[PDB]
Design a protein around this ligand. Structure first.
Ligand code: A1CLY
Ligand code: A1CLY
Lengths: 336, 333
């Protein structure tokens, strides 16, 4: 059928050949043009229309022709491919936003594109831009009345995803536009919880400057202890210079922070494994005191047992091997 | 007393001023030279002798003078500092081996240094040299009757530390010199367990030419599952070219490790080892798969029980990440 002629209009659109597109559409009845420009084309794992592919591929030159003259409906959705993950429900705007195609975004929403249509995971074009941290498209959409509040399937908001990937400038912009830094995901994670795991220290300070609230990971820990278990030490101390827990919860972070300098081989430093573990014990006998029930030796980590006295952990300051597994068991008593 | 001139000969020894050291000792009775050369000097928490520092600092010219003329006893031990750890029981030879001082090692053993003296932790000079991976001193000491077998307090053999720090050349020399590849530490960990943890693929094949590894690296693991949790995929697949349930646990834990592992995190590779893992645990009783109830943590998603379930989730980054955390907690805890 004219299914072959659709392949040609898709090919010209995907590769940005304005000259080819116009010559292909020039002498066509309106019935046929709506078929040609609305044809869902199977190319790889992408179900697309000429406009969606033209936008995903950043051929603004081609996108202009279709929206101005041939007046193509901007609400068309398809299933497109971004890197290695297939996304279904993607509109020309969402493809143009995720792929960071500056001009194409500005052209579609200027010609009336619904900036708040969502994929099946309910990622807005703004979220795509927040994931990749393209500041110009994040600024553009919000001042074009995009909804910073609409979040993904798992309540993971643009502010949360901007923090995990660490787009400091984008994160502060949304905070200024008064995005809620206390939203919670299906995980329970706050935007802070996320920035803590990835140690985006400047983002952590930005969120606090914008009256962010400390709340337990609804399904686990505090943002402090996710910093500790993630071993991001500078972050761990930042948060320990804001309202903490006297000795109690505060020392629990230090214990786990020093325990995380031990257990992961990537950033393993037994010197700071001891450094934090010892200072935790210091903050446990100050004035008054507060001890630890330790677990049996557990035939596994040899027969090492967790230290109960400062002098005890002092002894091991010469032994790498023992301090390393002292950390492995420190960690295992809080997590397990 | 003569404590002031003793301080001076230590200074000359540590800084390698052979001529200066010699100028201090020449018109001294043999009684006095033993005080000067036997003084244990405290710098920090360090107990040192002029000979030990000359060896720790690799000043061969000074070490020759001391052993040759003034005939200083090679026995003599002290407490020295290295990578940041104060080590007790260190002899001039052991210091020179950790510090990779080629000649000073060659000079000390020639005048009778016990190549098998052990620190307080029972570290051979061979172990020290194996940690630093200096192959020339590893061969030299071995060809002068060093015992590849004498291990640290925790049964950690020279082969283990050569694997952990990843000195392929030291590992292959030790294996060719016929080191035991099946020793176990107090953890239970074999040399492979260590090579897997750090993913030293070339060494892992080297041990394969010989070995055969049991269980536990500290938590009841085979070297395969230590590779999986460490996310070392290439190692996991190398080791997956041998003999067997155990197969599915490795793939599951490796793919579950690509999620939580922010260091080498790839959500695509989570959905790959987890998908290929789905062969035969779930819907029988194939074999038995007890899934955990959807606990408030990884949201309330529940672990996939059928191949078809994991196919739907082939897309969605958010969803596959919590699928890894769920598998991880089921195999671990
Ligand atoms: O926006 C997202 N993912 C994305 C798309 C395109 C791209 F280039 C980079 C990232 C999403 C996050 C959660 C659901 S969708
Ligand atoms: O590994 C050891 N010592 C060492 C390591 C690296 C180095 F550069 C210098 C010395 C050990 C000392 C006691 C037991 S093991």
């Amino acid at each position: 059928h004219m299914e072959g002629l659709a392949g040609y209009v898709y090919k010209a659109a995907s590769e940005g050949k304005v000259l080819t597109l116009a010559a292909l559409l020039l002498n066509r009845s309106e019935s046929d043009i709506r078929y040609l420009l609305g044809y869902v084309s199977q190319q790889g794992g992408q179900r697309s229309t000429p406009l969606i592919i033209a936008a995903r591929n950043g051929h603004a030159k081609v996108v202009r022709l279709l929206l101005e003259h041939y007046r193509v409906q901007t609400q068309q959705t398809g299933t497109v491919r971004f890197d290695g993950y297939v996304i279904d429900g993607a509109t020309a705007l969402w493809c143009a936003a995720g792929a960071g195609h500056f001009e194409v975004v500005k052209l579609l929403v200027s010609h009336g594109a619904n900036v708040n249509h969502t994929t099946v995971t309910n990622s807005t074009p703004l979220r795509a831009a927040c994931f990749d941290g393209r500041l110009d498209i994040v600024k553009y959409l919000v001042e074009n009345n995009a909804n910073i509040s609409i979040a993904n399937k798992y309540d993971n908001t643009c502010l949360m995803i901007a923090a995990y990937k660490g787009h400091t400038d984008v994160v502060r912009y949304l905070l200024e536009q008064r995005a809620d830094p206390n939203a919670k995901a299906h995980c329970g994670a706050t935007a802070l919880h996320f920035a803590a795991e990835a140690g985006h220290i400047d983002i952590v300070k930005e969120l606090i400057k914008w009256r962010a609230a400390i709340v337990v990971n609804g399904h686990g820990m505090t943002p402090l202890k996710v910093a500790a278990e993630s071993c991001k030490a500078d972050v761990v101390e930042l948060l320990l210079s804001h309202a903490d827990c006297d000795r109690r919860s505060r020392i629990e972070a230090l214990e786990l922070l020093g325990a995380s300098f031990a257990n992961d081989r990537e950033n393993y430093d037994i010197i700071k494994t001891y450094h934090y573990l010892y200072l935790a014990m210091l903050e446990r006998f100050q004035d008054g005191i507060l001890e630890k029930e330790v677990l049996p030796p557990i035939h596994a980590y040899g027969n090492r047992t967790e230290c109960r006295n400062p002098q005890e952990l002092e002894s091991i300051r010469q032994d790498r091997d023992a301090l390393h597994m002292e950390g492995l068991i420190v960690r295992e008593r809080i997590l397990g």
